[model samples]
Every structure is written in structure tokens, then in C-alpha cells.
Target chain A: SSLGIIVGIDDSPAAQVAVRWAARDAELRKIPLTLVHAVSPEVATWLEVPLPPGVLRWQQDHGRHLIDDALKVVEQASLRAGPPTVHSEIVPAAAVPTLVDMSKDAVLMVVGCLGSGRWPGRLLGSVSSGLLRHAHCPVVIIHDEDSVMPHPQQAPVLVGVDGSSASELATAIAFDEASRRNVDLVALHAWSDVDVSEWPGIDWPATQSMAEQVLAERLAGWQERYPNVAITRVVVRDQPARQLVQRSEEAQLVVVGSRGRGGYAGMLVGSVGETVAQLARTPVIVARE
Target chain B: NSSLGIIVGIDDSPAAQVAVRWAARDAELRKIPLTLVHAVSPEVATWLEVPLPPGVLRWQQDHGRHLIDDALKVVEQASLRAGPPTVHSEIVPAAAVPTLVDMSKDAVLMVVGCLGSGRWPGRLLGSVSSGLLRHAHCPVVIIHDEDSVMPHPQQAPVLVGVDGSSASELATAIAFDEASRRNVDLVALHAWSDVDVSEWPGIDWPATQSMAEQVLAERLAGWQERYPNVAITRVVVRDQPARQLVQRSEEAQLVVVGSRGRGGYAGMLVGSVGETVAQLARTPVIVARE
Candidate 1:
């Protein structure tokens, strides 16, 4: 069986956006798409007890209702080739662990990032964080409400590059996506945020040259492979995560390695990828390949 | 002397008690002071722009004090075996993650306890433990009740993941110190291949293996000399670092790994391997930093 794109469906506005995005992706690829809805089993908190059957039945019905609405969303998108083979399932479990298990056979796992304020909320909800940390496939997180929506047809795919293996994968994915969309690609490399003046004796020019070499070397192969995709490469001395977030505003989709050369050990996605996914005004794809 | 003590977050739970005991023992062995910190988040009231009920702050303070006293009792019992180390306790009216991160700047190690399975709850959200892991200024030790209760034999070796990064070296040094203190053997596990080169045609498996051996030996030599009393077992494999580390952790009493490794991006605070081991390891995991 071929791999399919999987998207989590819920009653939230962002979830609708995620469904639309995923449906569009499936149409472009002409692949199957699965819509999953998770219904929480009503439990008595603190006691670890279950609620009555009536409530449980209601929750299950509500989950199916959400799925029905998501199906409608895909139908309304009126995919050019009619629609990809769409399937829906309702699972009685929490969203994170359920989606994580489903991610194994998925080509891409998509979810809507929903939150309004503060650190944890601003960065991720439990579902987004858990999937980002543990999902086996690339994760596409769509931000809804107050986001700078891009003209998907014209906006370029943006990627963060460092010479790491994961970054190489990201470069490949970005190039592929750029080619698929027939749009330009923007490759950004953030070298360092070191205060050379404060350090005094540092050779700033030499450092900048090395950073330049890293970006060019990393992109050279991909540039040749995807000659039709025009690329704009930018190198800056700044915090990689913040720089990526700032530049993400003008891009259609921000693609980064699940782990980056700058990322410390314990991450599924690098700080740059995670931070960009959290704060980016556009949709972000953490390339797991 | 400059307040570089080992800090442990305290709560009135069996898990926190386990952490307190572990930290007390470590403080005694390292000859550092132990500071017990309990934090109470007032974000709800603050966000709503409402003053707390007249007695709520006082009640929270008293509750926090009671929990610290309970942790202190466990620490005292831990000291009965060896350590009568200097102990200090404090309560901060802030969220646990931010408070611990601020305190971590001046500490030798930041230790926290998680309940059985899944996540720690209430004030210590699942986010807090991971937040400290990712953002803390020093090394972090995460203790679980299961590991404390069903510990490996005292003879179980202390395991360290070595990847030749400066951060990994710090972890290696800490692992050696821990092994020496526990009077157990130290296992140095090195995964040479970041990816599978075996799939490639004409791959020199043996030569790659030998080079990995040399790298592992080179990395362990200094630590071996420094801790001659600690027995060393060097394992070189072409496996994924996180998989090998987590699999080996089952036979180890403690596993130490660096916050980030050589391939880490400049600003990435924690490495994926370290985080994976921390999350999945059955034993206590120390995410090492300088």
C-alpha cells in the first residue's frame, strides 16, 4: 500500500485550515488522505474513573460530527481532480498518542497549531509538541488566525541550511517542493550571533567567509539537481531560530530539518525548526527525511 | 562557597522524595551544598488582573514550606548514611520552569522527579521537566519512582554516551566521577555512524569499526587515567546513538549524556539523542553540561 497524508481533525477553526491545506497537498500529489478524529473517553479526574455511557456516547458522536465537517471541508475545496481517495476514522483516545501511532505509515502528518498567548501556548499545544517530538514522518503545522497568509502559487519555499545530514535532507525536500510548486526557493544560513566587537580579537571577516562556504557547499548539489527552481541565498550573522522566524513572514512554506547542526542533542526537531514552526507567520514543514 | 550547590525541585509527592534522596546523596559525594526549591505559580491570578484572596498567598507559602520540610526530612535520612551536607530551602512565587531555569544558572546540577509513566502533573506540568531539560543552564538529572524502586543491581555499570563533542566529553567526565563514586564499572558507548553507511556498496565495515574503536579509545583514555579506580568498558558500534544508548541504559544504574553533540546547530540547546534517552530510559538519566 502506498503512503498517504494524514491530518488530525477537530472542531477548531485551525483544524479546518489544516484540512484544507492537507486536501490541497493530497490533490497535488494525487495520493490518499486520511482524516482522524479522536474522542476523549470521559474520565473522572484525580480518581482515574470513567464517566457514564451516555456521556461517552455523546463524545463519540461529537467526534464523528467533527469528521463529517472535515469531510465537507475537503468537498468544498473542490480539488481539481475531484478529490483524493479520502477516508475517515474515529478513535477513542487522546490526539497526541493516537496521531503518533498513525504517523509511522504516513507520508506527512499535518496538524493545526492553535494558541493565542504566552510561552507554551505561543510555541505549541500538547498535540503539536508531542507530534513534533515523536512523529516518524515530516510534520506540517498550519497556523491559523492572524497569520500572514501567502499566495501559494507565487510565494517561494523557504529553507534553513547548515551542513548537517538532516539539513541536507531539508534542502532536498525544499528543492522538491519548490519544483513541484514551480516557485523559487530561498535558502537562509544564519552563521553566528557572536559579538565580535565585544570579543575584540576575533577575525570577523574570516568567520563570515567560512559561513559563506558552508551555505554554498550545502546548496551546490541541490541547486544543480533542481535547476528550474531559482534560488535566493542569504547568509547572516544572527540567531538561526529567530532569523528563520523573522524571514518566515514573506515565505509560503518554511521548511527546516527535524534536527539542525545547531540543535543540541535531545530534539526530534532542532531549535531553529521548532522555533520557526512556533512563531512563523506561514505554514512550517519540519523535514524528517 | 559561591552557592554552586545542587538544586532539586521539591513537592510533596513520592517522586519528589525520590529525587531529594538521590540529590542528597549526590551533593554529599560531590561535597556541594543542596538547595531545595518549591515554586508556586500565581499566573492565573496575575493574568486575570485580580488580587489573590487574602489568605491564598499565605496558604500557598505554608503549603510549599510543608513540602520542603518533608523533602528535608528525606534528605536528612539520606545524610544518615554518609552526608551531613549543607542544606538550604527556598520557595518562589513563580512558575516551576522559569524559576528553575533562573536558579539553574548558579547551580552545579538541576534535578527533578517525574511520576510513573507519561508526565508529572499540576504545578510541575509535563512541559516543566522538558523545559528544564532544554533550557536549564547546567546539567539535569531526571529521576523516576520506578527506577528508584526497582533499581538495577549495585554492580550495574554507569553508562555514558560519547560522541567526541566537547559536551560529550563533559558528560564522560561526569560519568567517570559517578562511576568512581558508585564504585561500579563505567560503560562508554559510542555510535560512530550518524547514518547507515552499510547500505552503500563497497562500504568498509571493519575499517569503519576499527576507526570507531580508535575514536572511542582516544576519548576514554584521559578519563580512564583520571579515574583509574573506575573500571571502563568501551563499546563501539555503528548504530543510531539514541537507540544504542537507550538499549544499554537498561543494564546501567545511571546514564549520562551531553545536552548537545558535535553536529548540534550553534544555538540548539539540547540534542535529540540526549532527549530521547531522558524520555525513554528506565534508569536515571543525567543530561550533562559544563
Candidate 2:
């Protein structure tokens, strides 16, 4: 029932990066790729003055051509990696909700990580929002070329597992990514609560052992699930956000939940999740409920 | 005479108006004073290559003071809704981020209106908002008229997420204070899972619950003696902390989160929750040039 992968395309070259990223996944996953590009929301904002038919037609045409060019990038994608089949569409809608709607059938959603001028302090319809917290499927946001790291086999796939149910799904997806790519999967578990200096008469060993057991218990099944995947487990006594970020430099892809366990109360915009997503050196995937 | 109180950054934008209203609402809830501020960036001074046409600098200063007073009038409208918390104003000759950050050291919280335009929390101007978050000594709230064209309803419980961690204490402290002032319950929600309990064979439910309670107790220790009537409720769910926090935030008066990027943010940006509730974004050249 999975609908392959959905990549949101714009006129920018960043869209091309997302395109190729999706293409590789589609190939490996053996599913079709649907590239979606949408128009800004004007109908909702400008109702009093309707656009002339000619203007509307021109906008649609421009949108079509934009996706048409995104199609060529699909061609540029390594045919060997995948995308056995590809399709493109341009709809007269805003990006966030449109992509969120596409999420219902998508196995995964891919988006460009680095975008310029997407900041208007805060806008409801910003395309970035859907990719961050709303998408129903796994989403990858590849950063700008100038700032991005090499995301090939050399870099490991990193995941932050905090002994939560959501962290399990994140672990599963991350393990799948590493196994398919045949790269190293580094599983990170950070404990900011390790500094019990003020807790008075608490055993540090007991706490550390508990932290160690957390990953070992859940990951035992993951390694069995991906027998061929090389696994590296890292347990540190630091903030989850800090650990993921420092390790992001060597990671090809950083995957975390939109929210996770073991931290101060998280908001719709999560702490470790958003911190890593914003500052990570490689492509970041935020998996969520 | 300026009183130690709530500070709201004002620009002439509609978003600024929304911010002032929220600040006034917050000030009323705390029965503290309110300060509406406007800034004429020193960058305006650097803009002139040649000598200014006489009185240009004073005109900019005087012009900024008028806008601050113009913003002061908004306090009148806000008072009708949240009651009159004494309102004050100051026009600063500095960048918005640093100006607000300096004020935050001695203040309870800082509020600002988000920009309404093309690209954002990504654009250079958006970066200025983020700078305020990383640097402000106090909690920072960024208001965006993103919900609806209609005015927002001013009612909800103060929700705070807590865990037995240090990062949670700050959020808990602010939530308790806000709830007491506003006559709302402090819904202190904590999340744990069977997995969190399952693997820890050594830790029992009674013990774990007690520890969680200890966390709440320690977090509330000092505040209890002060905020006597703010009803406290502890919620323990077998769920992910972030998802539930965000879920309850949907009904919360205001959601608070301690920063992982709190001190020495360096070049790292504050994440999305901060972006929305406290919208922070990228950059250096444009944000801190002053």
C-alpha cells in the first residue's frame, strides 16, 4: 500500500538534490516516485479581487514547466540507484498542507534542507513546516550544497534512541537505511540526567548501567532484524541535542523523531529533534507520530 | 519611572500590534508593568556615506520616540481586555536582538512580533529573532498572527513538560509562575514508557513514580511557598514526551521549553518550537553586525 516516495519540488536547485535523494530511495525500495510542486496560497488571501483567467492559466503553465524541469533532474539521478518509474505534478495550492495531504499514501517524503528567504518570522503556510512535523511518512531534508556533507557510504547513518516507543520506530528506519546502503549505523543514546551530583546518594553506576541496558535491550532485536548491517552503539552523558549535533559531522544522514523521550517537556517543535535538524551537517530525517 | 516588568518589542507592523497585546495580557495576568519599546538601529547611522542633512539623527530618534508612544496607545486597547497593567515606553538606538537581550537579564520575559513577508525564519531578518532567543537571559516569546485572521481567544491552562532532568526545571518554574498569576492549573506533564520501566529491572514503579514525584517536588519546592493557589496536577503517560507536550500545548495558555542551545549558542540556531513560540533562524552577518 506504500506509494513509494514524494519529493516536493520548487524552482531551486535544492529541489534537484531532494529529487535525486528520492530517486535513490525509490530505486532501492522499488517503488514509483511522485514529484509534487505547488503554487503559493493566494486564493485564500486574495478573495475580494479574483485573478484574470489569463493570469491563472499563466501561473499553471509556469508551475507545469517548473515540475517539467524537475523531471529532467530525475533523469540526471543515477538510474542505477533507482526510480524505476517517475512522475511529476504541479498543483494550485500551498506547499505544506499539499505535501501533508500527499503523505497519506507516501512511504516517504523528501524535501530540500537549505532554502533561502523561507523566513517571514513565521508564516502558517511555509513549506518547511510539513516536512518538519506533519508528514505521515518518513521525511528527509537535504541541506544546501555549500554546507552539506558527503552523504554516501563513507558517512554513517545516525539515530538517537532514548528507550521510547517512538525511538524504536526511528531505530527501525535508521537501521533499514544503513542496511540498504550497507553503511555503518551508529546508534546514539545520550543521558543528560547522568550528572546526579545534586541528587544526593544516587549510584552513578546504577544509572549508567540503566542507560546501557536501554539501548542494548531494544537494539538486540534491531541487529537481529538487520543481520548484515554493521552497528556501532554510542552512549554518552550529555544532552541529546548536543550529542547528535557533534556527531552530525561524520554522519551521512541524521534521523530523529519530531519529539522523543528523555528530555524536558518538548513542544510541537521538539528540542533535540529541531536542534539537530537545524544544525546537523548532513541530511536529517525527522520521524514522528 | 520604569518598573521591572514585561517587555514587548514593537515595530509598526501588524505583527507588532499582536505582540503588544499578548505582552499586555501577560503583564495583566502577573499584575506587573508593561514596557513597549521601539528601536532605530544604529545601522541607520552607518547608512549615511556623507554628512546627514541637519537634524537627520535627531529626527530619526524623535521619529522612533513617536512610534514608541504610538505603540504605547496600544496599551489602552490591551488594558480593556486584560486590565490596566501600567504601560511604559523607551526608544533605543540599537539593534532589536541585543536591545531586548539586555533588558531580559532583569525582566521576566521578552515578547516580539514576527515579520510578515516573503521568506522567513530563513531570511536575514528572521535570524535577528533567533538571536534574541539564544541571548535573552529570560524566556522569549515570539508571536505570529499565523493562526487566523480572527483574534485569538485568551484562555487555557498553563502547560509545562517536566522530567527528572535539569533542562525541565526552567520550564517548570516559568509554568508555575504563569499559572499562579493567571489563576490557572499548572499541568505538569511527565512521560515514561514500559520500555523506560521494562528494561530497568532494578527500578520499580513505586520507586520510579516516587523519583518522578521527587523531581516535581524539587522543581516545585521553592514555588509552593509562594504560589499557594496554583493547582498542581501531575500527568504520567506511557508516551513520548515531545508528542504529548505538543499535544497538550494545543490547549495550553503558553508552552515553555528550556534551551539545549541556551548558553554559548555560538553559530548554532535555535530549533523550530523556538521558531514558532520563539521563532529563531539562521545567520551572522545580518543578525549581529552591530
Candidate 3:
């Protein structure tokens, strides 16, 4: 279904959490949900040899079961409204490309915040980060179910407002989420890379007030729309990514904007959102319009 | 011994020369062979679905060979331990990141310039370097062009990011080894939280600071015994690890951090804090991979 929430599925504990998160989100928004399980056929291609008989069949069966299990997880989520209609797909390809292609028609893509098989000790899963970089829609990364934010409803939704067009989209999403969850919204503006206080010839107080004004202006229109959601404004002289991640602990969900243009320059200047997504203790939504 | 002890991605950039020098010295110190690689990606031609001019492939191969030869000379000129370190050279016809990552399996460490042949001086971290940081099978060392410009003091310490996790322990071990080899002190720093206490006002600072100190001391105890000659500096703070490490990197010769830390995902090859330090540090950074 067009504009449905898409959740990447696997047997991992983190993916199970992602499925549940997506399911609840879909139910709340009253949209369909699509569960995607991708199995790479790299072994046969890399070996340049035909697979052993039934290998492909066995993998297909395994993928089917993985999606079935994910469906069970979706079923278990207590949707206030009945669970969203769910569709499952088993694709014979790698996770990143497979999910990326589906992202074009999807409203949002969800993935677990765990690593892939390529390496150990990765903070963000390859598929999740890859989709963040390339996806046409917003990407939500869910932490393990056992992680922090045990009482998610009690916590406010945190959003980083940088005054960029992408930040506008992030503000829109954050207000929507805060309104939906019936939680408060914390609009944070962290400025002065390298800590401007350490440098000379700069009006620290003036700059700080300017940042405050920026945050206020960014949230002005959105605040009117979501009057039920109380807004808290925070302005600090800190790195944006670091400030966002540090504050993520007390937040139920953190939304940051990204205008990833691709390549080295984009990485150097446009990685604030990606970095926050990678480091935050809470679930992160990298909003892109 | 496992062959290809250390691998350095080589190119025509001045920063690549620094990487070669750093890799050569480390290889000599470790008494292992160093492999220098330069990749000529022919994928461009393949993607275009057009045949290249008759000698264009040959010209690219020749240029790669010349770059490797220049790197070899730079290594020889450094006059590292034992006169000259054993060196091997390779010119792969593939993308730089994938080639280096594939070769990382056989390497004890992978080294590269912060900015690659892309030669973007303003760039903090190049695509190939970040790719290897995410995918390399072994520890990756990134040296900046400025590292050779100002040149760190001989007495500069090797900074280690410690959080008492298994990955931090690996970083601690690597820091100790480097300090011992360089005859420098090791700064083992542990930041209990990535956020400042002012932002987290409700926490007990005194208790957290004490606990952080204990964690740092405990993590360094075994390494201290192993490298008694290498003076140890224990720094415990209730601040952000990336900011602390980047600040201390100015005074240190090198910064060593785990790919992931205490709260880091078990599967994330490089933690966000560690990668941030590697990107912003003024000195060379080594992202420990275990």
C-alpha cells in the first residue's frame, strides 16, 4: 500500500522491537504496515558456483518464518485501535538496497539500532544508517525494547532545531509526534561549534540570545497548531549532535533534521543528524522532506 | 607470523605521505612487514559501459605504481628502527575503500590519511577513511596533514578513552603498547557520561565522579603492570568523552579509542564517541578493533 509504514524484519531481538514500534505507529496513524525480510544471495554469486540443491528454498523458508515471527510481534502490540493491515515481503537481495527501493513509496522506514554481520561493535546498524543516508522518507531507529525510556509516555519528545529547511521538517514531525503521544515537546538549539567561549572577539551572550530567538521562531507556528502539547525551549552553547544525544536520555523520542547531499562535504557538514541518530539512547527520527 | 602486518592506503596527497611515515614507523616498531596500497578504480569505465582508450588502463596502472614507489621512498627516508622496515607494495584495480577493507582481514592494522586522494583540505574525514572505520577487520589509524605541520612534542602522551568495557580494555591495551614503544606516557581518560552535569542536574556528581575514577583505575591497573615504564595519567571526569578526547588530543601525540564503548551497540564497529574523536582530533587517531 502507498504511504504505509515499512519495518525491516529479521529474527534479531532489536528487529522484533522495530516491528512492534512500527506496528504501533501504523495503528496510531491509521496506515497499513509492510514487513520486509531480505536474504542476500551473495554466497552463490561470490563463489561463482551454483548453490547446493534446496539452498535457495531453505533460505526462502527461513525468511518466511522470520517475517511470520515479526508479524506475531506486531499482533502482540496493544493497538488502541485494531492492528493495522500488515503486508510481508521476502526479497532475494541485500538489506540496504532492498529497503531503500521500498522507501520511495513508503511514508516512513523503521529498522533496529543494532549492527550488521560485516563487523562487530558498530553503534548503528548498516542497513539503518544506509537508509538514513539514501532513503526518500524519514527513517526511525528503535533501540532494544529493554533500553531506557521505560515510561515513554511520561517523557517529552525532543527535537533539535537548527533553522535549516530540514530543521523545519523536523519541527513539523516533532510537533506531530508530541501531539500524538500526548507528551511535551522540548525544542533544543545548540550552537557554537568548538565552544565559542574558547574563542576571541565573539559576543557570547548576544550569540546565545540569537540562538534562543532562532529556536523560538522555529517553533512559533508549530506551537499554535499543537496547543495541547506544552513546549520547552532550551538553548545551549554546545555541539548540536552531542547536545542532542546527551538530552536524548530523558526523551521518549528524538527527532533531528538531515539534508544529506552525499559525498565528503556532505558528511563533514551534514552528519549532525546521522551522528545523533547513531548515538542517542532514545529512539531517533531523522526527518527529511 | 601473519603476513601484511600493517597496511597503509597510499596516494599522491601530502597527507598520504604522513600516513606512510606513520605506518612505516609502527611497522618497524612492531617488527612486521608493511603493505602499501594504491587503488585505480576501473569501475568508472565499466559503469559507463564504454571501452577505454587503448593505453588508458595501462596509464592508470603506471600512475598507481609510481605513487606506491614514491610511498616506499618516503618510508625509506624516515630511517625507522633496524635501518629499513620490510615493505610490500600493491596496486589494486578496485575502489579504495572496498580494497582496503577486504585487505584488512590479513592486516594487524589499517592506516590512512584523514583526507584521501580526493584532496579536500577542508574535509574532516574522507569517504574511504570513514568506510574503513566502519568496515575494517582490524584497528584503523587516521593521520592528518596538520599532524605533520606543527609536529607534536616528543613527550606528548598517548591518549586513551576508557569506559571499563571490553572494547575500552582493547583500546587501553593498544594505548599502552604505543606509549611503551614511543617511550611516552599514557593518558587513560574515562568520562562517565557524554553529557555535562549541568545538563543532567539531578545526578549526584560527587558519587558519579568517584565511580568514574574507580572505573578508570580498574581498567588501567593491568596495563600499568604490563607497561610500568610508560607513565600513566588517569583522568576521570563527568563530561562528554568525544569533547574531552578531542580537547586532550591537542596535547597528545596520538589518541586511541575503542570502536565502541560501554553503552555502545555490541555490533557497531565504531562507536559514535570514538568516531567523533577520530574525526576532530588534532593528532592522529587509532580506532581500536578487536
Candidate 4:
């Protein structure tokens, strides 16, 4: 299936940069693009006048003006190539919920972190928070400061695996993405000293060696299937989230199963995925099986 | 008494299988006894259209033993020699979360799979993991089944986000200790954006922006000198600080941020920036408290 990207734009440089970034991703992935604007109802209500029949029409027209301005920014950045198809919509509601609702049909949602506002030091708007908590799809929070746009590059696609069913599914997805992108795949496993307490009366070194052998056996088939893609296996004595984040530095994309091994029986995500999604430097894909 | 042997909630799900394998390996590595507990709701069983026969119960016991035996086999097959696995299995009447919590009183660390058979749908924090985080007496590790990209030890960089808050200082200390121990580069990043001077009517926008940058630079100077080996990169821009910090975290081995800032509202609520960044960034965020 083709990927669909929905970008939320405002009248800010950051938003403009995000549009440019989204357009590039869409072009590369060969997906359609939808641009949405969340118009404040308070502004619309205040602007309503004695006009009888065409008031709502006029409000919609005004919203179109804002979307047009944003479109101009995207166009100026040369984001659209070969007359890239563009669809625009303006919703008369708060920003977060509207975007969150719209994201259900989209594979990915993109938003800028900063805007033209009074509070300059803040990290994100209230709307972004709401979307992060509730959005059904992955949300890419873009920060366009004084840095140039990220260029598409061929780097290893890092995936975290703990041998869970969901994680095995995640690995399969990561493998496909890496194969499609023609990037290498790096599988990481983190084991901490605290984990050793689970088995009493075992020689620590011997047990670690045995565990590595099991891990290797499990991965042998996947390695053979994707022989073209260089695969690196790592086992660390540290927290999974920390090790994954550290490994993400050299990775193009990081894929994780929504939940972890030894998690609650019915959760879609665990603390490790939550931590990675919240703090990692790279774009993270939370795969659901 | 030393913490109760490591306890793991087990089920027939693939996630549970992974959890059992991980727990078994961990127990062997740590030289701790491992207990695999599966909670069965007898009330629900009684309400079933078809009651389980006596033979089925015996079969289940046999299957549970086989599962434990398989886990032991994996441990024994490892290249590194390990002691005989001391594995135990139990079927309880209570729900998984409460049982895990009660068992945690004597556990040094509690481990659970991210998703289980009886988990609440669409939740990132499963009931058991959430309960453990909130109420358990020991540390918890919700192991991800797909996290296989282990970080290279030497080249990893310790990256911490600083906003001149007490919690940020605490985060800095944590990052510093880890970096020093690992002998890795310590990156101190500060993300800043210019305030909109248009709101103030007559204020100079560039001046305000410059002043903020200057103050941020000055604050980072002392630390740079203190950790001479640390490589510091301070950024000032016309963008949201959280977005920049999250982006920076991508290339960092570890990203540290303050739990609450100076402008944070009182209570345990996380600030908007921290919450959003924590939820969206792909890196693990360490929220250091003051």
C-alpha cells in the first residue's frame, strides 16, 4: 500500500520547513499529500457579522486564504515536483483534536514544533501534545531551526528485538522497509546486569554465552533471507531504551514493536517503546503486528 | 532476605513466550531463581460455555512444564556455560497486575512483556507494567521484543538537553557520570528560539533574540570548562526548544531532559514540551527530577 502523509501547517518558518520535508518524503515514497489547517473557531465566531446567508461561506473563504498562504510557502520551497497533487482542508475547531482525528486515515502525520507566538522558549504547543497522546498513526514532530533540511541517505535501519511475537513482526516490517530503501539492518539486544537475578545458581559468564547462542540461532534464518543487507547484531548490558537510542545515532530509521517482552499481556506498547518515541534523535517507527 | 527470585507473568501469547525466554536467560545470568506465573481467572472459566475437563487441566500442567523446559533448554544451549535452571511455574486465581505487584514486594526487579493476552487494548503502558511503575518496590524493565540494535560502547555520545532548570542540572549530573564511566563524549545541547517582539509593540526583536542567546551561551560556558573533555554544542534558533531537542536526540546514544522546568505548573503533571517530546522522540528520554 502507498503511504499517505498529512501535514499540519501554520504561518511559521518551522511549519514551512515541515511542509518541505513532508513533500520530499511523499515524493520519495510515491504517496499522495494532504495539507490541513485548524482554524480557531473563536476567530471565526468573532468575525461573523450581519451577513445573512453567506456567513459560513465567507468564513470558509477566509480559511482558504490561510491555506493558500501556506501553500505558497510550500510551492516557493520547490517541494512539489511534476505538479504534485495537493488537497487542502480547513477545520473550524481546535488544532490537536482535529489533527488527531484526521490522522486515523493517514500513515504518518507531520507538524512543526514552533510557531509565531509570545512564548519563545516553549518546546511545543498544547495541540502537539494532544496529538502525540491520542493520534492513531505515527506523529513526526519537526524542528526547523537554523539547520538545513535532512537529505535522504542510505543508512542502517536499526530495529530493537526482544524475540516477542509483536517484535518478530516488527523485525519483518523493518526488514521490508530496509530492503525497499536498500539500507542495511541493525538488530540490537540489550541485557542488563539486573536481569541476571531471574536465574539463581548460574555462572554469569556461562549464562551470557548461552543466551548469545540462542539469540544467534533465532536470527540465523532472517540473516540468510536478507543476505544483501548487512545485518549487525549487538548485545549490551544496559537498559534497552538507552542502548537503542545510542544505536539510533548512526541509523536512518529505528523500528520498534509497540510493546516489549515481559510486558503486560495485552498492551500495544511498553515503557521502552514509550521512552524511544519520546526522546530518540531519529525518526522512530512503532510497528504494530 | 534477598529479593524474591525474579518473577515473570507468562501466557500462551508470542509476547509471553519471548518474555519467558528473556526471563529465563536473565535468571541464569544473574544467578537468581526464576518463577513463571500465569494467572487464570477461575470465575471466567466457570462462566465458559464448555467447562475444562480434568484431563484438560492435566494437559495444561504438562504444557506449562514443557514451556518452562523449553526455556531451560534455550539457556542451556547458550555458548556461555550456565548452571542448571531453577524454573518454577504457577497458575494463580487473581489478575496479572495485582499479583505481579504483590509479588514485587520481595523482588529486586520486576520484568514483564510489553503486551499480554489480557492487556487493555491501545494502551502503551500495560496494566501490570503501569502498576509496577507506580507501586512496585523494585525497578522495572519492560523489555521490547524488537530492540536489537545494540549501541557500540566507545563511540556512543551522552547527549543531555539543558534549559537552565534544576531538573536539567540533575539530568546533567546523571549524563556526566555515565559519560565519564563509559569514556564517551558528553554533548550539552541547549535549544532556544527568539521571542516574538511584535507582541511587545516597540521592542527590538533582534535584540531580544540576541540577549536570550547570550544568556544561554553564558550559562553553558562554566560547564564546558568543568568537563574539558566534553564536546558542547549550544544552539539558539527561532524554533521550539523541544522539537530541536528531540531532533538532536536522534544522533545521540542517550538523550537527557528535565522532568519539570521553571515554568512548569505545580503537581506531578509533565510540562507540554517535555510531554510532547517524550511521547514523540524515538530516543529514550531520561526525565531527571530536581
Collision pairs in model 3: A121-B267, A121-B268, A121-B269, A122-B267, A122-B268, A122-B269, A123-B268, B259-B271
Higher lDDT: candidate 2 or 4? 2
Classified by CAPRI criteria, candidate 1 counts as incorrect
* Candidate 2, A1-289: lDDT as tens digits: 2557898887565667777777777887788899887764243210133444665666677678877777776766655655867888777766776788788898888887544334323322135554675677777776655133234556788998765667767887898888887888999876541221222343446555666766676689788888887888787754566678778888778888876653222234455666666666777888865
Error of 4 at B144 (Å): 28
lDDT of 4 at A44: 18
Local distance difference test values of all predictions, in order: 0.72, 0.61, 0.74, 0.59
Q: Ten residues in a row with the worst lDDT in model 2 chain B?
A: B281-290
Score every model by TM-score.
0.54, 0.52, 0.55, 0.45
DockQ of each model vs. true complex: 0.02, 0.02, 0.02, 0.04
Better structure of 3 and 4 per TM-score: 3
- Could you give the candidate ranking by TM-score, starting with the highest? 3, 1, 2, 4
TM-score of 1: 0.54
- What tens digits encode model 1's per-residue C-alpha lDDT throughout B200-259? 344445766776677677757877888889888888886567767878888988999998
lDDT tens digits by residue: candidate 2, B1-290: 22558788876566667677777777876788787777655442211211123444566677677777767776767664655457778888875666777787767767775552222232322433555655666666666654221234445667665544354566667777667766767677665431112222233456445555555566566767778898776776643444455556656656666553122122223433333334432100001111
lDDT of 4 by residue, A1-289 (tens): 1227788876676677667656655655657777887755432111122223344465567668768876775565443371256678888765676777788788678776566551433444555444554566766655554222444467788888877776787688678768766788888865541222322343445545555666677778887887887887776644677678777778877777666555544343566665565455566666543
Off by over 4 Å in 4: A1-3, A10-17, A40-84, A112-129, A141-152, A192-227, A265-269, B1-290
- The C-alpha interface RMSD of every prediction is 25.0, 28.4, 21.4, 15.1
User: Model 1 segments beyond 4 Å from truth?
Assistant: A1-21, A25-78, A81-289, B43-52, B115-125, B149-153, B196-207
